[PDB]
Amino acid sequence: KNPKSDKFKVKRFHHIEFWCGDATNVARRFSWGLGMRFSAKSDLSTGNMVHASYLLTSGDLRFLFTAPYSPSLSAGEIKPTTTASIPSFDHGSCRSFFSSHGLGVRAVAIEVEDAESAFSISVANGAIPSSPPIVLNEAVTIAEVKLYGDVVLRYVSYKAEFLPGFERVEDASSFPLDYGIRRLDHAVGNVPELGPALTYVAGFTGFHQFAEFESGLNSAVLASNDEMVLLPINEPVHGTKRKSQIQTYLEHNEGAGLQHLALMSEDIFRTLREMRKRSSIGGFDFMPSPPPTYYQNLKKRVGDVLSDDQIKECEELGILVDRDDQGTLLQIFTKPLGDRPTIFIEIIQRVGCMMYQSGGCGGFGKGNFSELFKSIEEYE
Amino acid sequence: KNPKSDKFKVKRFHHIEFWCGDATNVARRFSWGLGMRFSAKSDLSTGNMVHASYLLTSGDLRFLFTAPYSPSLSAGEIKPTTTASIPSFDHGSCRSFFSSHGLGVRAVAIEVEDAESAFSISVANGAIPSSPPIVLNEAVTIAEVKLYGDVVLRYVSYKAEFLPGFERVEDASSFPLDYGIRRLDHAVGNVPELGPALTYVAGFTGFHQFAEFESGLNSAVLASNDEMVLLPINEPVHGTKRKSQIQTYLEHNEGAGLQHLALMSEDIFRTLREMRKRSSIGGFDFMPSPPPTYYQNLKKRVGDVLSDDQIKECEELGILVDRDDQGTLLQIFTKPLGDRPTIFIEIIQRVGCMMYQSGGCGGFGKGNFSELFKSIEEYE
Ligand SMILES: Cc1c(C(=O)c2c[nH]n(C)c2=O)ccc(S(C)(=O)=O)c1C1=NOCC1
Ligand SMILES: Cc1c(C(=O)c2c[nH]n(C)c2=O)ccc(S(C)(=O)=O)c1C1=NOCC1
């Protein structure tokens, strides 16, 4: 059941913004590790004396890496005279975010029809304002409200090229990498209490709970009208044998924040081959693969969807598999993206639910908690 | 003339430590960009609740990348109970360094016979103490004094594997990259006033001025007894037509600091081929090459040292060439390593002065300032 109760018109995920201490180095690492090309910049070379921002793109996926310059470069400016291309940016906020959380996501940005309306309606419905709507070069409106922890939900809308003041990256600098990643599927937050977090976010968006079908967590998924914007939220379960990974997140992150980003690949096998090639030469590592018993147990579960070959390929790459009552999903998880055991990345591909493919086809892998535990009872 | 006036026994450059906001991402980028393997770690997985430190090595070159964790992970510790592997580390100092300077070098570390003696004698001779000598697992002594800005000169000495508490990196994680870089040749500081900086550093080390042979700078090189430890220092020249790049450094860095690191390659041609292959896929960019007139002018200057082929190869790669009265050097410069126009890297290879090769053979490229200007008068 989907009540389609969005309080304003939402389109798709637009971009994810990381707040960094050095944007160059994080961006170059991510570019090579994920096969995303350098697409636009806003920095000293573009007249921006406030922050360095570098945009990586793969298909529709947009990753933005931003870091502050010395405040002294812009000490003469005021907000009316600012050279920043992202007017919500604040040196103190950025430095405090990075020093508190380490590398992580500051903004989950969605495109909307009218960012000013989305902000006003959100705030009228309990959203805590973070940055008021601002119109950029009479073309793009941007506004921000608090999502959880120090993460904001950013509304972007276009009257009619990333943002004004960003320049296209020179053809010599932008190598056309591509490992098959195409768009953001979902963005997951970790909080201490799921109930109040859900109430808040569902409160100001009108997003509805996405239906699904004891490992230390409870969760729930909020979804937009066409369920293409998917925002799961986790809370820890205390008192379990194995200490809750959600609680470990909260301790090392210094509170709530974005836990993982799920990136849809048009070919998860090519994506994982390409990423695994680069794990030890500057890219990303992957969590330990499941035991071969897990892959022997796949024939009974998805033998009508994956051939023995495609199952074998899953085993080569460590890919996990789950199934809805509607569809099937292939997924796998990176190790944390930075120093702390906090944010990681999920690679996903969904099979089924053709109408275009409907959102969340196959679910989010909830069944893989039990199937992993069961399969990892292969000590005999 | 070399008075060999070191006030304590100095061996060689031991390592360079960068202070980062996320050590993982900087280290992975540098590893791929420079062909340096992951050699040791000290982090959560090794019991270090204070800082993440990752060591990259190429030949004798050691690059250390360190970032702080949340202070809360170690809030119960005191210095006697610390889990940090680098006892000089301080959360507040590291965060203040990175927020003030952005990504850059915190420590120039040299190996000495006796780090406790080197510290005591240095401080008796005007050095500003930064971290007192501390003995690690009864095996290694480490001590730090101020060098310039927020950069320290670190003394390391071994009674008899990087530092205690560091673990070797698993054979699966450490890919054996190597683009030919073998050791640190020199480390250059930028200061507002050369005179007082030289007086200070020469004051507490006994390092002597290295002999050499209007583009906006003055400089001088301090050297150890065998002139294998080489510490040049620059100051800006104000009032020139083209604004002093040294002054631009000081403004964007918020004061004095390490300007460039010069890394010796055993084969600069292979090194530059390998690095240039990776410039646009996560590695380092290089400054704009000189005009072909520069390379036509090379036959008269080094035609007795480089063949037409090796000169042509220089032209392919943008390599610059200078000559002492003793030797010849090949050099080239990266664009800044991070967001700010501050620290960059020099790749160098020296030809001549065989006895082993004596330090600074060929100089530092001072003649290339005039030769670049002259050659870049090719507008007709
Ligand atoms: C995060 C995760 C998902 C996941 O993406 C979602 C679950 N719920 N929602 C809304 C999600 O997006 C699915 C399976 C597993 S797993 C390895 O157990 O098979 C895991 C992990 N557990 O810890 C490490 C990775
Ligand atoms: C830094 C530099 C050196 C250099 O390494 C040293 C000079 N003195 N000392 C002690 C040095 O180590 C040599 C030639 C040039 S250059 C491009 O002019 O030919 C440059 C640069 N100028 O600005 C950009 C790079």
Ligand SMILES: [Co+2]
């Ligand atoms: Co997920």
Ligand SMILES: [Co+2]
């Ligand atoms: Co140099």
